[PDB]
Amino acid sequence: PIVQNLQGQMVHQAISPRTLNAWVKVVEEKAFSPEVIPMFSALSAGATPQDLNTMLNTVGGHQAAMQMLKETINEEAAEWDRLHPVHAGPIAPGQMREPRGSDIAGTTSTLQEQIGWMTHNPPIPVGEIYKRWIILGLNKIVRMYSPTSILDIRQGPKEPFRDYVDRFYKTLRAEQASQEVKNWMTETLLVQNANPDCKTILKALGPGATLEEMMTACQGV
Amino acid sequence: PIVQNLQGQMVHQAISPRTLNAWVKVVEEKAFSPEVIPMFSALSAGATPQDLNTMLNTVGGHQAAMQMLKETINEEAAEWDRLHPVHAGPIAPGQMREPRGSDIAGTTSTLQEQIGWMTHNPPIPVGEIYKRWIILGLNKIVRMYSPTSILDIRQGPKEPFRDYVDRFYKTLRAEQASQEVKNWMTETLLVQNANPDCKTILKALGPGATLEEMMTACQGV
Amino acid sequence: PIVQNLQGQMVHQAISPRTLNAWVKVVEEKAFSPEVIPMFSALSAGATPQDLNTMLNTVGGHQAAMQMLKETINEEAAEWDRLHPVHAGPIAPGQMREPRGSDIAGTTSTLQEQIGWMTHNPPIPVGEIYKRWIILGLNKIVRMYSPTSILDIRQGPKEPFRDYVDRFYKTLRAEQASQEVKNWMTETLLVQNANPDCKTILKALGPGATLEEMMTACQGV
Amino acid sequence: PIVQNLQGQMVHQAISPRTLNAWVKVVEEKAFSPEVIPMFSALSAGATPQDLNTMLNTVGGHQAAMQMLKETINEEAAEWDRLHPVHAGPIAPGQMREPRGSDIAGTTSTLQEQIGWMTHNPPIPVGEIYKRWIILGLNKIVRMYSPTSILDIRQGPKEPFRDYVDRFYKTLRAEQASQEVKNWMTETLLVQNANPDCKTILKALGPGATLEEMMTACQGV
Amino acid sequence: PIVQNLQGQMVHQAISPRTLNAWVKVVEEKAFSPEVIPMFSALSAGATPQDLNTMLNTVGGHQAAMQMLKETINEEAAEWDRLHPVHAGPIAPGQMREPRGSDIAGTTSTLQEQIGWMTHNPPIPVGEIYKRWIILGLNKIVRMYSPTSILDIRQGPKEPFRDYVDRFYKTLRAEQASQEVKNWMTETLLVQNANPDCKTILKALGPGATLEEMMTACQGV
Amino acid sequence: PIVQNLQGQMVHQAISPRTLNAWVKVVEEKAFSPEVIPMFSALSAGATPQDLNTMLNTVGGHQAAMQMLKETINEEAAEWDRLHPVHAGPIAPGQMREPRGSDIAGTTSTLQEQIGWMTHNPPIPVGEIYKRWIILGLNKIVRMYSPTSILDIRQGPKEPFRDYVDRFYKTLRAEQASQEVKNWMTETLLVQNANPDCKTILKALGPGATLEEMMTACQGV
Ligand SMILES: [Cl-]
Ligand SMILES: [Cl-]
Ligand SMILES: [Cl-]
Ligand SMILES: [Cl-]
Ligand SMILES: [Cl-]
Ligand SMILES: [Cl-]
Ligand SMILES: [Cl-]
Ligand SMILES: [Cl-]
Ligand SMILES: [Cl-]
Ligand SMILES: [Cl-]
Ligand SMILES: [Cl-]
Ligand SMILES: [Cl-]
Ligand SMILES: [Cl-]
Ligand SMILES: [Cl-]
Ligand SMILES: [Cl-]
Ligand SMILES: [Cl-]
Ligand SMILES: [Cl-]
Ligand SMILES: [Cl-]
Ligand SMILES: [Cl-]
Ligand SMILES: [Cl-]
Ligand SMILES: [Cl-]
Ligand SMILES: [Cl-]
Ligand SMILES: [Cl-]
Ligand SMILES: [Cl-]
C-alpha cells in the first residue's frame, strides 16, 4: 500500500501478512455476504493495483465469482479507454504516460508506474479507480449469490418483530436497487408483510413512524 | 484514523486489520451489552467518518439495530443542518467548504475533505462529531435490547448480597435515565428490594453508608 | 496513552486493540486476584484519564466492584478539591486552568486539556494521579473479595512445607495491612501455624533464619 | 527485505517472524494449489535473494518439488550468464561487479552485494529477477501437481451450473497454456461440456454472452 | 523499557502487552525450569526497575519462590549500600542523587529518577544491576526446585545413550556448582554412571574424546 | 538485534517476544529436522552474540544436542584464537580491543563491546562469525539425529515415483557430504534404486534428463 508517513510524505510498503491472512479468512468464512465488501475496502486502504490483484489472486475456490469479477473489470477498463483515449507521442522528462484501463487494473503497468501515477501532482488515483471497479464486481456477485428476494420476507405468526426486521434488512442489503427504491421497500413492504397482529398495530401508528417506535410498538406482541 | 505522530504533526493511516477484527468479534460475542460502547469508542480513536462507517458496515446481522442507528444518524444530521445552514458562495483558496450533516456522516464527503476539516486551523472535529451521533444511537439500542427493568431486580432469600448488587448495577447501566435519576435508584431501590434479613441490617446502617460498608455488613447473611 | 517518542518529545496515541483485549481477558480470567493490579498498571502505562476510563468501562459484569471503585474515586476527587481549591479568574494565554478532582478522573475534562496538563512545564501528571486513585480502589476490592484470613493458614500434617508457604504468602498478599504488620505476620505466624514436626525443626533454627533455609530445613519432612 | 521508509530512502531489514510462519503454514495447508503463488509473491515483497532463499529453505517435505525448483533456477541462471557475460577487470571505486546467475540466486553473492545492486543508480533489481525465476518454477510444479485436465471437466446431470463453473475455472487456473488458448477453452468447452438442459439454454444465448448472463440463465435448471 | 531508537538516542516506553503475557505464560507453563531464566533476561531487555518489578509482581501463585526472590534482593541491596554509602548533601543542578539499594530495586525511586540514572553520563545502569540481583534469586529457586541430583543420573540397561545424555545434561544445568566443578562432573560421572556395555566402549575411547564421538560410539548399543 | 533503521544508520534493539517464541516452538515441534537451520538463521538476522546465546539458552530439553553445540563452538573459538592472536597493549582512544573466540561467542564480551565491533569502521561482524559457528554445530546435530542413510532409500513396487523422490531428497538433505558427492548420489542412486518398471523407463531417457522429465515419465507407472 501507500500511506501518509510521520512527515506528511507518502511512501510505499508491502501488504502486511496479517492483512493478507485477514482477507483470505474473511472469504473462507463469510463467502459473499454483503459485509465482505466493506471489509475488502478497509483491508485494501491505500492499495496499489498490484496490491489489489494480490488480494484477489490469493482467493482459492469461488472461481466462478472471480471470473465474473475479471469480466466486470474488463468492461470498466474498456469504458475508461473510450472516455480517456491515449495520445501518441514521446513522454517528456518529469512526466507520466497516460494510463490505459489495463494499466489501472495492474496488468500492463509496473509497480513504479503505479506509484508514479498515485503520487503525481495532480495525482491520478489509480488504486482508488481500480477499487471502484472491483467493488462494482463484488456487488454483482453479492446480488447473484443472495438466496432470497425482499418480496418473500414475511413475518411468522409467532415470530418476534425484531427477528423479522433483522431478516428484512439483511435481505434488503443484498438487493441491488437504488436508495429511492429501497426507501419504497421500507415504506411499503415492512408493514405490509408483517403478521396480522403487529400489522394492525403498525397501521395504527400511521405514516412517518420511526423503526424504533415500530419495534417498541410490536415488542410484547 | 489520524494520530499525533513522532514529531507532533497529525497524519492519516488506514484502520488496522486487528482493529477491524476486534470490532467484528466484539459485536459477534457481546451483541449490544453496555460495555460494547466504550469498546467501540476505544477502537475508533482518532477515526475519520470513513473509518467509522467502515466499522459499522463490517457488522453482518443485527440489521434492525444497524437500521435504527442509521435513522438516529439521519436525525442528528438534520439537526446539525438546521443549526449550521451552509452559506452559498465559491470557496476561497486555502479554505474548506462548510460541512453538512451528510458530510459529517461521511456519505457526501471525500476522505481528503474529512482530513481537510479535522486538521484545519481551527479544527472542525468531524470524526468526533459523528462518533457522538453514533454513540447516541448505540445507547438507544442498548436500552432497546436490555431484557430487564431496574424495578424488577430483587434479592433472593438465599442470594449472597454481592451477587444481588452485581445484578442491580448491571441492569442500572442499561437504563437510559440521567445521573440524578440513577442516584435516586441507588438511594431508594437497592436497600428497598434487598431480602428481609439484609434489608433490616442495611436500614440499621442509616442514610449515607457506602456500598463497601453495605457489602461488608451483609457478607455473612 | 502518551510515550517518549524517537526524538525525546512526548506524543498522544490511542490505546492499542491488544492492550484493550489483554485487559478484558485478565479481568475475565483472574477476576480480582492480587496480580491483576500490577497487570492493570503495566497495561495503563502513560495513560490519560480518558484511557484509564476506557479500561474500566470495557469491563462487563463485576458491577458491584466497579461501583465500589467509582465511590473510591469520588472520595479521592473530593479530597483533592479540598487540598487544591480552584481559584476563580480568566485563564491567561499560554496557561492551563487548575484541574478539579472530576477533571483528574476524566469526567469534566477533554482529551486536549488532559494532554495540556500532562505535557505542561512543570507537568501536572493527571494520568498518574488518577491511576493512584484507581489502584487504591482496586486494593479495596482485592481485600473485599479475598476468601481467607492469614490467621487461618495452617500447615496440614502431611502437607509439603513448600505448599504451605505458597498458601501463606498468597493469602498475605491479599491482606491490606502495612509492611510492619506483614513483617510481624511472617515473624510470628508462619512458624507458629506450621505442623508439629516442621514447627519443631524451625524453632531449632532460631530467630533470623531465611525463608530459603526454612524451606531446605523442612524439605524431607 | 527492502522497503521505502518514512523519508523516501530504501533500507534493509530482516524477514519478520510472522512472514516466515505465514509462508510455512501456507505450504503446509495448501501444498501447491495455484493461490500459493500470489501468496508467495506478496510475502516476498521487496525481498533480497537471501530472503527468498530463506523462504524456500524453510519448507520441510515436498523435496521433489523443491529439487525441481532448484533445477529451474539453474536453467534460468545459465540463460542469464549467456545473455550477460561478465567482463573481466578490477572493479572501480563507487562501482558494483556485474552479477552472474548464481549471484542473482543468492548462492555466490553476499547480502551487502545484493543490497549494493538493488539500491544502485540505476538499480539492478536482483530480488525481482530471482523472484521471476522462482515463480516460473512454482508454475511448473502447480501444473505437475494438478490432478485433472480441463478436457475432463463435465457438468453433472443434477449439478448446479455454478458448481460446474467453479470446477471449470479452478482446473483452468492450473493449466499452463497462454491466455489465447485459455480464451479458446472458455469459448469452446464451457458450453460444450455443460449438461443437456443447460447446454441447450446456453446455445440459445448465442456467441458473446457474459458469464454472469450464462449463470443467471442456468440458475433454476 | 529503554531502547536505542532510530537516531541513536535512548528513549523510554512501556512494556508491551505481548511481553507481559509472554512472561506470565512462561511461568505458568514451565514453572522454574532452567530455560525460564534466559527467557526472563530476553523479555526484560533494556528494562527499568519499575519494568522488572512489573514482571515479578504479575506472577500469581509461586509465592514461596517470589518471597525467596524478595529476600535475595534485600540481601543484594544491603550489600550495595555497604559498598556504596550515600554521601549527605544538597544535589547540584545537572546532577543525580546517589542510588541506594532500594532505589536500584525500584521501591524508593521514581521512574524519572531511574531514567535519570540509566541515561546519565556516565550511565549508572540501574536496570542491569537489579536484573543481576533478580537472576541470582532465580538461580537459587531453580536449584531449590530441582528434583534430582547429578549423582543419581545413571544409564538404564536398555536405555539409548542419547536419552541418558539428555537426562545427564538437564540435571547438570540445574546444579549450582561452578564451571570447574561441572567440568569434573562431565569428566568423571558421565562415563562412570553409563551402563555396562556402553561404559566399556567409552573407556576404550580414552581420555579427551568428544561428546559427539561418545554418542556415535554408543549409538547401536 | 541490529538493523538498518529509517535513516541508514544501524541501531540496537532487544529480540522481539514473537521471535523468541517462534524459535522455542520451532525446536519443540520440528526438533532437528534440516529446515530448522534456515529458520534459525532467519530468526537470528542481525543478531548480537548475546542475542544468539539467548536463543540457544531458551531451549529446554535436547541438552545432549546443546552440549554438542557448545563443544563445536569451543573448537571454532580455539581455532579463531590460533589464527588471530591478541596483541598485548593499552587500547587507544577511539579503538576497540581485538576479540578472542570467547568474545565472539559472547561469554567474555559485553553487549556494548559487541555493538562496538559490529558497527566499527571497518566492521568486525562478530554476530555473523558466531552464527557461522552455531550453524556448523547445528549441521552436525542434524546429521547425528538423521535416522536413515541415502543408500537405503529404495522405491517400493507400488510406490508412486513422486513419493520416492520426496523420500530420496529429504534423506539427501540430512547427509553431510559436499555438493559434488550429492551430485553423484543424484546421478547414480535415484535411478539405480527405483523400482523395476520405473527404472527401465528412466534408463531409456538416458543421461542428462531433468527431474521434471523423470517425474512426468514415471507418473502413470
Ligand atoms: Cl475460499
Ligand atoms: Cl498477484
Ligand atoms: Cl494468480
Ligand atoms: Cl487520465
Ligand atoms: Cl454479528
Ligand atoms: Cl464502508
Ligand atoms: Cl456497506
Ligand atoms: Cl461548522
Ligand atoms: Cl468480566
Ligand atoms: Cl469510556
Ligand atoms: Cl460506559
Ligand atoms: Cl494543581
Ligand atoms: Cl510442508
Ligand atoms: Cl537459508
Ligand atoms: Cl537449507
Ligand atoms: Cl546486468
Ligand atoms: Cl503462575
Ligand atoms: Cl508493579
Ligand atoms: Cl504487587
Ligand atoms: Cl554509584
Ligand atoms: Cl524443546
Ligand atoms: Cl542468555
Ligand atoms: Cl542459561
Ligand atoms: Cl580481527
Question: What is the full DSSP assignment across A120-142?
Answer: SSS---HHHHHHHHHHHHHHHHH
- CA F134 from chain center: how many Å? 8
Contact D127, D54 (CB under 8 A): no
**Alpha carbon distance C212, C219 (integer Å):** 10
> Roughly what angle, to the nearest 10 degrees, separates helices F126-145 and F36-43?
160
Q: Across-strand partners of F10?
A: F4
Residues in chain D: 221
Q: How many CB atoms lie within 10 A of CB C176?
A: 11
Domain boundaries, chain C: 1-149, 150-221
Q: How near does any CA of chain F get to the CA of D220, in Å?
A: 40
Q: How near does any CA of chain E get to the CA of C212, in Å?
A: 6
**Alpha carbon distance F64, A93 (integer Å):** 66
Strands (E) in D8-118, as ranges, are 10-12
**Alpha carbon distance F136, C206 (integer Å):** 56
**Alpha carbon distance D201, D182 (integer Å):** 23
> Roughly what angle, to the nearest 10 degrees, separates helices C49-57 and C126-145?
30
The string of DSSP codes covering F175-208 is ----HHHHHHHHHHHHHHTS-HHHHHHHHHH-TT
The string of DSSP codes covering A58-118 is T--S-HHHHHHHHHHHHHHHHHHHHHSPPPPSPPPTT-PPPP-HHHHTTSSS-HHHHHHHH
All three cell numbers of F116, joined, read: 562496538
Q: What DSSP element (H or E) covers B40?
A: helix B36-43
Chains touching C, CB cut-off 8 Å, 3+ pairs: B, E
Which residue is listed with cell 556485474?
A: D98
Candidates C136, C211, C145; CA nearest to C174 is: C145
> Which ligand lies nearest to the CA atom of residue D53 in the structure?
14
Q: D181 Cβ partners below 8 Å, 6+ apart?
A: none
Candidates B55, B66, B59, B44; CA nearest to B128 is: B44
Are residues E4 and F13, on separate chains, in Cβ contact within 8 Å? yes
Which residue is listed with cell 513419493?
A: F163
Contact E161, E215 (CB under 8 A): yes
**Alpha carbon distance C57, C59 (integer Å):** 5
**Alpha carbon distance B107, B85 (integer Å):** 18
**Alpha carbon distance F221, F219 (integer Å):** 6
Largest CA distance in chain C: 75
What 8-state DSSP symbol labels residue B151?
A: G
> E134 alpha carbon to ligand 18 midpoint, in Å?
15
CA distances from F32 to B168, C107, E167 (A): 58, 58, 18
Contact B175, B182 (CB under 8 A): yes
What backbone torsions phi and psi does residue D85 show, to the nearest 5 degrees?
Answer: -70, 125
**Alpha carbon distance C142, C139 (integer Å):** 5
At B3 the three-state DSSP class reads strand
- F52, closest residue in chain E (CA to CA): E42
Candidates F157, F158, F189; CA nearest to F171 is: F189
Which residue is listed with cell 523442612?
A: C218
Residue type, C115: I
**Alpha carbon distance A159, B4 (integer Å):** 50
Neighbours of ion ligand 22 (CB under 5 A): E 38; F 53-54, 57
Contact E54, E15 (CB under 8 A): yes
Contact A110, A102 (CB under 8 A): no
**Alpha carbon distance E102, E117 (integer Å):** 14
Most D CBs within 10 Å: which of A11, A23, A74, as the mutation test of the D interface? A11
Are residues D35 and A59, on separate chains, in Cβ contact within 8 Å? yes
Candidates E205, E202, E206, E150; CA nearest to E176 is: E150
Residues in chain E: 221
**Alpha carbon distance B133, D15 (integer Å):** 43
Contact C141, C32 (CB under 8 A): yes
Contact C91, C98 (CB under 8 A): no
Instruction: Give the domain A150-221 fold.
Output: 1.10.1200
What 8-state DSSP symbol labels residue E150?
A: G
Q: Across-strand partners of A12?
A: A2
Contact C107, B179 (CB under 8 A): no
**Alpha carbon distance F13, D14 (integer Å):** 13
Which residue is listed with cell 526524538?
A: C7
All three cell numbers of B91, joined, read: 470557496
**Alpha carbon distance E56, E37 (integer Å):** 12
Largest CA distance in chain E: 75
**Alpha carbon distance C47, C6 (integer Å):** 18
Q: How many CB atoms lie within 10 A of CB B158?
A: 7
Report the Cα–Cα distance between both ends of chain F, in Å, rounded.
Answer: 52
Residue-wise burial string across E96-112, b where 16 or more C-beta atoms lie within 10 A, e elsewhere:
eeebbbbbbbbeebeee
Contact D23, D55 (CB under 8 A): yes
Q: How near does any CA of chain D get to the CA of F87, in Å?
A: 30
Number of H-type helices and E-type strands within chain D: 11, 2
Which residue is listed with cell 467518518?
A: B49
Q: Determine if the peptide bond prior to D122 is cis (ω within 30°).
A: yes
Q: How many CB atoms lie within 10 A of CB A89?
A: 8
Q: What DSSP element (H or E) covers F3?
A: strand F2-4
Helices (H), chain D: 17-30, 36-43, 49-57, 63-83, 101-104, 111-118, 126-145, 161-174, 179-192, 196-205, 211-217
CA torsion, points C64, C69, C74, C80, in degrees to nearest 10? 170
> B221 alpha carbon to ligand 19 midpoint, in Å?
31
Strands D2-4 vs C10-12: parallel, antiparallel or unpaired: unpaired
Using CB atoms, pick whichever of F34, F45, F215 lies closest to residue D144: F215
Contact E119, E10 (CB under 8 A): yes
Q: Does C11 touch chain E (CB under 8 A)?
A: no
Residue type, D172: L
Residue type, A74: N
Instruction: Calculate ∠ Cα D170-D172-D177, nearest 5°.
Output: 150
Q: What DSSP element (H or E) covers D165?
A: helix D161-174
Q: E11 Cβ partners below 8 Å, 6+ apart?
A: C4, C5, C6, C8, E2, E3, E5
Candidates C203, C216, C180; CA nearest to E68 is: C216
What backbone torsions phi and psi does residue C113 show, to the nearest 5 degrees?
Answer: -60, -45
What 8-state DSSP symbol labels residue E209?
A: -
Candidates C163, B106, D172, B107; CA nearest to B115 is: B106
- A8, closest residue in chain B (CA to CA): B11
Instruction: Calculate ∠ Cα D19-D24-D27, nearest 5°.
Output: 125
Residue-wise burial string across A130-142, b where 16 or more C-beta atoms lie within 10 A, e elsewhere:
bbebbbebbbbbb
Q: How many CB atoms lie within 10 A of CB B196?
A: 9
Q: 3-state DSSP: chain D helix, strand, coil percent, rounded to 5? A: 60, 5, 40
What does the H/E/C string look like for E158-175?
Answer: CCCHHHHHHHHHHHHHHC
What 8-state DSSP symbol labels residue F89?
A: S
CA distances from A25 to A21, A30, A40, C8, E216 (A): 6, 8, 12, 40, 48
**Alpha carbon distance A155, F131 (integer Å):** 70
CA torsion, points F191, F196, F201, F207, in degrees to nearest 10? 30
**Alpha carbon distance A173, A186 (integer Å):** 12
Q: What DSSP element (H or E) covers B125?
A: none
- CA D127 from chain center: how many Å? 15
Contact D169, A62 (CB under 8 A): no
**Alpha carbon distance D26, D35 (integer Å):** 10
What 8-state DSSP symbol labels residue E122?
A: S
Contact B85, A59 (CB under 8 A): no
Q: Does the domain made of B1-149 have the CATH classification 3.40.50.2020?
A: no
**Alpha carbon distance B125, B104 (integer Å):** 9
CA distances from D105 to D41, D114, F41, F55 (A): 16, 10, 18, 29
**Alpha carbon distance B129, B134 (integer Å):** 9
Neighbours of ion ligand 5 (CB under 5 A): B 27-28, 61
| Residue C119 buriedness (CB in 10 A; 0-12 / 13-18 / 19+) | middle
Residue type, A174: A
Residue type, F159: E
- C186, closest residue in chain E (CA to CA): E67
Task: Tell me whether chains C and D touch (3+ CB pairs under 8 A).
Answer: no
Q: What DSSP element (H or E) covers F61?
A: none
Task: Tell me whether chains A and B touch (3+ CB pairs under 8 A).
Answer: yes
Contact A96, A122 (CB under 8 A): no
CA torsion sign for C61, C65, C68, C72 is negative
Q: Across-strand partners of E4?
A: E10
- A36, closest residue in chain B (CA to CA): B58
All three cell numbers of A72, joined, read: 466486470
Q: F109 Cβ partners below 8 Å, 6+ apart?
A: F49, F99, F102, F103, F126
Report the Cα–Cα distance between both ends of chain A, in Å, rounded.
Answer: 52
> F86 alpha carbon to ligand 6 midpoint, in Å?
66
Q: What DSSP element (H or E) covers E12?
A: strand E10-12
Candidates B10, B20, B80; CA nearest to B44 is: B20
